[PDB]
Nucleic acid binder design. Sequence first.
RNA 1: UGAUGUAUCUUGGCCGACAGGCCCGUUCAUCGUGAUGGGGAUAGAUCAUUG
Lengths: 170, 152, 91, 100, 146
Amino acid sequence: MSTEKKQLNPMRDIKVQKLVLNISVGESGDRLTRASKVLEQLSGQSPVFSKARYTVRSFGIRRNEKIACYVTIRGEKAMQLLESGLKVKEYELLRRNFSDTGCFGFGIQEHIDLGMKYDPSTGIYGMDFFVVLERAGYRVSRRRRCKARVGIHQRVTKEDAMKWFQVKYE
Amino acid sequence: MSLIAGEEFQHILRVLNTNVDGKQKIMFALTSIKGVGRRFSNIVCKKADIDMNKRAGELSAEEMDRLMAVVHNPRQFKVPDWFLNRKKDYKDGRFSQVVSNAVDMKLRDDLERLKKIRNHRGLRHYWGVRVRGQHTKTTGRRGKTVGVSKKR
Amino acid sequence: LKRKPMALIKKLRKAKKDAPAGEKPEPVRTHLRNMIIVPEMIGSIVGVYNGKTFNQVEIKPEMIGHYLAEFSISYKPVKHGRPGIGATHSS
Amino acid sequence: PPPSSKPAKSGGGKQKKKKWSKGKQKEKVNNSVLFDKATYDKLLSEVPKYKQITPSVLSERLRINGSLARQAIKDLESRGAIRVVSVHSSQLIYTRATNA
Amino acid sequence: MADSTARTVKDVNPHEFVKAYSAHLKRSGKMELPEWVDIVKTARFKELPPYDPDWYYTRAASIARKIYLRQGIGVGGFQKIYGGRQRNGSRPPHFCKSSGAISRNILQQLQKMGIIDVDPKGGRLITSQGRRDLDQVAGRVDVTIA
RNA sequence: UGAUGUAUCUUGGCCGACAGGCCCGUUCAUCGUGAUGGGGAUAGAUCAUUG
């Protein structure tokens, strides 16, 4: 329903909902969740434990147990992450990783970034940095009481996404 | 605490990716380096401005940074394919050095290669037999399975 | 494309046979067509006869041996006249 | 006294892997913990009164300190004059504190 | 002061000789490498970063004790002496020497200085000057041994 | 009882990393007893030479 043709912006322009940096490997294969250390450094705040629910067929009977780790960041902290993260995968590159929904994600070792290797006791190769982009009004699908779906009208587009991010430092 | 000339420290690299070496002198440690012989290792340190006896793990940040860049790419050395861009697939690109995960990754591209091309090399991989010639007379247990009871 | 004299490899080029040499231009000028029944294996590849129907006899049948879009800076007998030797102890 | 199992079409049995492995050294030689006093006084200095002279390697073994690691320690002490070494080819030799 | 010296240029366990000599060799004007070394010159380990005490000198010094007694001695006489170049077990080598490039470079610098001359087939022969530094040094050494 | 580095048909010598192609004719830096600085298996890239 994209209504652009008016007299526009400041509510329309994109913002960062979140950056989630998530590891998926498992326990035992590298450790407890020790690339939490590496997350800890790159992002700047502590990652939180990922448990699983549902199926595996492959070892992974324990269910409730540590297997993964994540950092959902946002404000300045997400952006500050983007700046370092944004520059490492090369550019430019590419429409395919963007969804139509207007989010984009990439992989690489935590060791990419400025950072000491020396502090991370382990490095671990890859897992999604995910960037959630959205308009101001999101708060309607998010907030509890008066949830309303986000309309086609509101929802970010890959074109819109590429533009706002391509606007900045890549 | 009081700032003493090197912290306490110890260190974790990823360097290429995923890899964490230590205990060793830098020259000798680098040999590990998914990129070096004993021959290579001495060169990179002095060019980089790193001593022999300095362990790679004890070093300060910028000394390590210079390592990470110099190995894959550096001063009076280079490497570039060239010829006329003609040749499709596979080539050499000019001795990938480089080395390490890019080389293991290209070593797959190279396995995959021969096979579609339909050369005698590729044709051997599909079969699973060792490609650059052994005695055969015995030995090759590895090449396509364990000792497999009698036969028929 | 672009192309001109001189090409790489590793200690092969000089004088070479003449009977397969005289044969090969002929399908250029009178077009792509039938395979060429040549046992002669010592004829180093050259980019003039690119993308053309060839055969070689490793021995009792012909084994069609196309110059592809890939197949050149390699050696002629590799292509389809040893995979028969090899294939039949991997079946 | 026995070996291990026996091979399998493959194959071999082995059985054995070790203690381990710490005293990695040269890293702990730089940072203060082993370098400052303790290694010198405890290992090196404490050992000497019981036996006036000891070979470096023997010292190596009892003390469970790397041959390189207390080569450096020894050298510092030597400068102090606390210890006096002699020589030998195999980097082996003898370690003494004081003659007396 | 002479007595220990003289002789000792000859008879003294190298190892203090070569060491002793290399420091005296440092002073000289020359040592142009024109970047030939770098490509992969010697045994394994052995590219020339270490070399400023460890290869270059001890090599320059090296020829020099050899030449007095051995002479006349030529480039093949040099190349060989350290080297292996053993017929392999085929599981080894071993290392690989060169050493036409190596030998050549050490001999040129010495000639400019006036130290070595070449006979038209017996290889090059010690000058008055070449004996004169080698032996006046073999002088310091015999004292340090005894 | 180790490892490695240094030191202890051919040639002259100019140019080269092996591999060539010519003009004449035990000492001690290291090794820390480490499936590694052990081990060289294997596979790929690629240069010369015998032919």
